[PDB]
Design brief:
part of a larger assembly; 4 chains; A mainly beta (about 55); B alpha+beta (about 80); C mainly alpha (about 150); D mainly alpha (about 50); C: mainly alpha; 2 strands; about 55% helix; rod-shaped; D: about 50 residues; mainly alpha; binds potassium ion; binds magnesium ion; binds zinc ion; RNA-binding; large ribosomal subunit rRNA binding (chain C); RNA-binding (chain C); Large ribosomal subunit protein eL19 (chain C); rRNA-binding (chain C); Ribosomal_L19e_C (chain C)
Chain lengths: ~55, ~80, ~150, ~50
RNA sequence: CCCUAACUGGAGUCCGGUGAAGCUUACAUUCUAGUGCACAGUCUAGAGACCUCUAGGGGGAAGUGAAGACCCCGUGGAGC
RNA sequence: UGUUCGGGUCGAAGCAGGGCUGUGAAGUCCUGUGGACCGUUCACAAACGAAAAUCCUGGUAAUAGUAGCAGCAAAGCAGGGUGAGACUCCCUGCCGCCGAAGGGGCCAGGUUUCCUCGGCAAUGUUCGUCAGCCGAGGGUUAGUCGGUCCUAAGACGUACCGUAAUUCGAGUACGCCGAAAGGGAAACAGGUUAAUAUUCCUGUACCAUUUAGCGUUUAGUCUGACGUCUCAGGGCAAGCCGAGCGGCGUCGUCGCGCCGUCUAAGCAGCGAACCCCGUGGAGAGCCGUAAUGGCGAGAAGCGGGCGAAUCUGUAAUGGCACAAGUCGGCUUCACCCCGGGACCCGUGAAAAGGACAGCUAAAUGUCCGUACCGAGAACUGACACAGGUGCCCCUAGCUGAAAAGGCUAAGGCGUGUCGGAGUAAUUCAGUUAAGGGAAUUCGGCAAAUUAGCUCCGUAACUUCGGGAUAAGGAGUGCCUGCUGUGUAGACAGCAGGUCGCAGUGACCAGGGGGCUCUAACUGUCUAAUACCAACAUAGGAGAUUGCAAACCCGUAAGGGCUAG
RNA sequence: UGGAGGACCGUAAACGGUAUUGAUCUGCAAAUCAUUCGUGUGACCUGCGUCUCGUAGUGAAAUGCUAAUCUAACCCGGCA
RNA sequence: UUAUGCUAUCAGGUGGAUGGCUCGGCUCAAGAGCUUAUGAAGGACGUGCCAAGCUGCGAUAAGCCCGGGGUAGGUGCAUGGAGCCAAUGAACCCGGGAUUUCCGAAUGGGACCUCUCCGUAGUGAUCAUUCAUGAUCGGGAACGCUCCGAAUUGAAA
């Protein structure tokens, strides 16, 4: 069975749900974490310095 | 906080009046107990049962059966439907 | 006429048949086109304008003639057999019917006094051992050996 | 017949009622300057990111 | 296979409808030889060549597709 | 930009074309177009000059009215409508497709695609009046169907401890979640809409909790609660046959063919096997089974208890052309009940819940889902995609071993959405082919041969299992009349007659043998060029370690192996 | 009689993917189609759930697979 | 009437360059500078007569109340129809209040369920105090402090 279009017919599920906290469809249904805002992992909002460039 | 918004007046909703039932658009946050108490306080007729459904407009519709015959007609005349 | 397709679908629902079973009168097309509700379709159905065409079954008469001949033992020769001997007559079923017939025969013979327990036991084991082809063979062995307590 | 909870169906209902044309009177009022909006879609396309 | 023939259905061919893409600096009806970065439709000297269209198989355009994966080079990498 | 001097609605900038000057970069003027800004001196600045970067962005050619709209399901025609317009939309008939899937049900997913009306610019591989398209409006009703409840593998939270620290980390303790295919309290038939219907309505039921009265533990057990293979018995949906009745078809002759002849839950009644209890006393042996078996440690026989599916009645008036509606028989999968056996170096979940003491009445039963598709057009693969998800679970008659293949129902379709025409080469896929028969070719690649079933017969070699369907031979249809086995369904066999080139007549359906290499074998693999001799395997051997072990993970706290 | 086996034949059930080096190769398809083939009671196939991942995981081991990406994935950042 | 074509100009189509305009951007300077359990920021959903997006607002939902300024119109981006409001002083602006769904630090429990379960109506976790009470939590463009800490690269390796 080809790794291309044939295996893409099994895409009848999800790995990420809608996030309560931020509204992004980034809540991992297995790890119970939002990969966008960090909901379900931290009480704070997920932010990294590498999300932008070094400001210089 | 009243759960009752207004009577639903469509063809199918008006077909209920000939079986003494009356359909309302209600607050979707409310339940059958609140709908029954709100209608009984709003018009003072005893409610036999409540049927409720949610629509694809995001509304909640409640169908109310009344105990006293002609109560649906009396409320529909008081509102101004008939 | 515009589409009578809505009326045909409604009439197939009301008649409980398939869509192509529904017959719409090609002369009463404008009468049908005015029918919007299930009550109108019911009226057209009751007045014969709309009906369900007869189901065209599969007739089975020539299969009946063949089945009668096969019951008589014909049309069933080697050039007609396609399944293995064993798919046409399973062997365990053959043994089951054979041994049950033999055992019932022996039981009735022991019951009605024609067979005492000593020879009944040996005959029962012989039947279990495939010594007799059928009830007739067992009876023939009984009469040849004179094992029946005749009176 | 997938099974939605109350909120998932509410979000689907909002997506459905967003998929409407701009009113004709809005087009008249804006003098043909507002004739569409970005939430138009078709059900048989790239699906909703809602449910 | 000798050695191919006839026939069947779908394409193709012709008609109506619909309707893309890929090569393209230019010019261009060529052929021979020579010349030239030693493999030229365009240079040189000859020989040919009235134009347009259709069908056709692919000789040529060192046809098109892809900054050769072979070889070497780089004080370039990666894995082992 | 500073500064000097100006031009412009009596027409600035820009744009198209032209005149003149300048070696030139360029400048200026003229005509048209355009409608509000533009220059100039001396200086000063810069995000300051493009033909090139397989340059970037946009626009737009040639190709070209060309390829495609064929191959895996070659499907349409007549007549009548509608409409401005009809191969393509609607009706009737005829002719077709699928018919163990292209029908039926539904998961995930989709998310309004559902229904009605009104449209046709785009979408639809053509057209279109049609439409999953466009616009407007409408549509989803539950104590009993699911979720909800329970726990599974396994997550998550808090605490503790670690960590420089944390949103990081294993373990422990306590919690909590985790199944729309596991467990599970209870509802059926009919009707109703355009679209919902075990949800609304009619009829007839049932379950749970709380309350009130009437009575109370047996309490800790059982149930929930279980693998694979195989088989008996009983039942039954579907299926089939005969008779009556009621329709339809056929009717050149005949009297056949088809359809129907119905009936839920609930309630009440009976109860097969197994098991148990009381009698009984059975061996130079008896009793059983499909089979294994059983028996003085108590067989057969005889009584009793417990205990099914289903069946019978009632619900019986509902729906049916208020047309009939009455009967029998056979079989029964692929479903239900029940019991047996065999296998395991494999042992086949848990918990909620339920039962064991409840009866009567009244009240309560909230929340979420519910439309429709479920795929050759509603999902996913950018698509109305020949893939995948799903063939996931179901399926009528004949042939036949069969759910194969063929031909037909029901149901779904003529949309695996371009048509016409019939005339070259060539081409994709097929049919046939004299005589020869592998001479072809790297190589019998491709194609052809054989083919079902019954009977006869079957070699070398062998690990004794096999080789084996070896090989090689014969038969096979139809009709008439029968025989045997069997409770039956059926199965097996015989005699005679007879037609054809041909009787497994189509469909379906091995070609066979000999000698070598290699790997023992079934199995695994380069998703998308390698299905092999490679990997694995059982077998054989070696090594470490006595458990606070060997080996291994972690920074630690602590872990895997190890419930060993 | 019995009904064992990583037993046999065989399905366009399901799974796999031999050969045609066929069709297709701006495809129906960024791996499909036809015919022909292998397994088809078991080291079987498969739904849903759940866990294991980047010098890590997974692998009956091909450097195979880990979202069309694999001799060290992907995203952003170091980075102009 | 020489077709198919070729070259130049013109007219038109297509297209959106150029010019002109700009409520936008960018940079620099001067100020000002915390907020949230009295539930923030952020998100979801709802909210308009005809309303789909954005914006505002929160079931009192393009809004409600009071004081001041303003004064004759108003009804957001966004002059359409029809109404409504406004001299009882609206709109608008400044100040102060009210309302303020669900999620979210999110905090009665649980979230592939922005909802759901118990309802004994909710002080979740860690802490201080006498045990009335109180503190901490999330957010903020950069700046600040503490701790952990690469490689490309350069050295022409
Ligand atoms: K349904
Ligand atoms: K050996
Ligand atoms: K260097
Ligand atoms: K180096
Ligand atoms: Mg891949
Ligand atoms: Mg920085
Ligand atoms: Mg060097
Ligand atoms: Mg340029
Ligand atoms: Mg067929
Ligand atoms: Mg079209
Ligand atoms: Mg409901
Ligand atoms: Mg649970
Ligand atoms: Mg054609
Ligand atoms: Mg092998
Ligand atoms: Mg090996
Ligand atoms: Mg096989
Ligand atoms: Mg970078
Ligand atoms: Mg803070
Ligand atoms: Mg260096
Ligand atoms: Zn989030």
């Amino acid at each position: 069975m080809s790794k291309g279009t044939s295996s893409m017919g099994k895409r009848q599920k999800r790995t990420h749900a809608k996030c309560r906290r931020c509204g992004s469809v980034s809540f991992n249904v297995h790890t119970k974490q939002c990969t966008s805002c960090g909901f379900g992992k931290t009480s704070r909002m997920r932010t990294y310095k590498w999300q932008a460039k070094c400001k210089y | 906080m009243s759960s009752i918004n207004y009577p639903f007046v469509t063809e199918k909703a008006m077909m209920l009046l000939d079986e003494n039932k009356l359909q309302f658009i209600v607050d979707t946050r409310s339940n059958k107990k609140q709908i029954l108490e709100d209608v009984e306080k709003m018009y003072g007729f005893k409610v036999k049962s409540v049927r409720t459904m949610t629509t694809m407009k995001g509304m909640k519709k409640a169908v109310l059966a009344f105990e006293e015959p002609e109560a649906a007609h009396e409320i529909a005349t008081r509102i101004g439907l008939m | 006429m515009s589409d009578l397709s809505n009326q045909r679908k409604l009439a197939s629902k009301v008649l409980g048949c398939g869509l192509d079973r529904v017959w719409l009168n090609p002369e009463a097309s404008e009468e049908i086109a005015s029918a919007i509700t299930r009550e109108d379709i019911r009226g057209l159905i009751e007045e014969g304008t709309i009906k369900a065409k007869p189901v065209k079954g599969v007739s089975r008469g020539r299969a009946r003639a063949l089945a009668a001949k096969r019951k008589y033992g014909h049309c069933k020769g080697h050039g007609s057999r396609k399944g293995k001997k064993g798919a046409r007559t399973p062997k365990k079923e053959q043994w089951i019917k054979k041994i049950r017939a033999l055992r019932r025969r022996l039981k009735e013979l022991r019951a009605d006094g024609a067979l005492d327990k000593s020879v009944y036991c040996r005959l029962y084991r012989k039947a279990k051992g495939g010594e007799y082809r059928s009830v007739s063979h067992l009876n023939s062995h009984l009469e040849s050996e004179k094992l029946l307590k005749k009176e | 017949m997938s099974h939605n909870m109350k909120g998932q169906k509410k979000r689907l209902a909002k997506a459905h009622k967003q998929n409407t044309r701009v009113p004709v009177w809005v087009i008249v009022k804006t003098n043909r300057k507002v004739v569409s909006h970005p939430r138009r879609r078709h059900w048989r396309r790239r699906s909703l990111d809602v449910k």
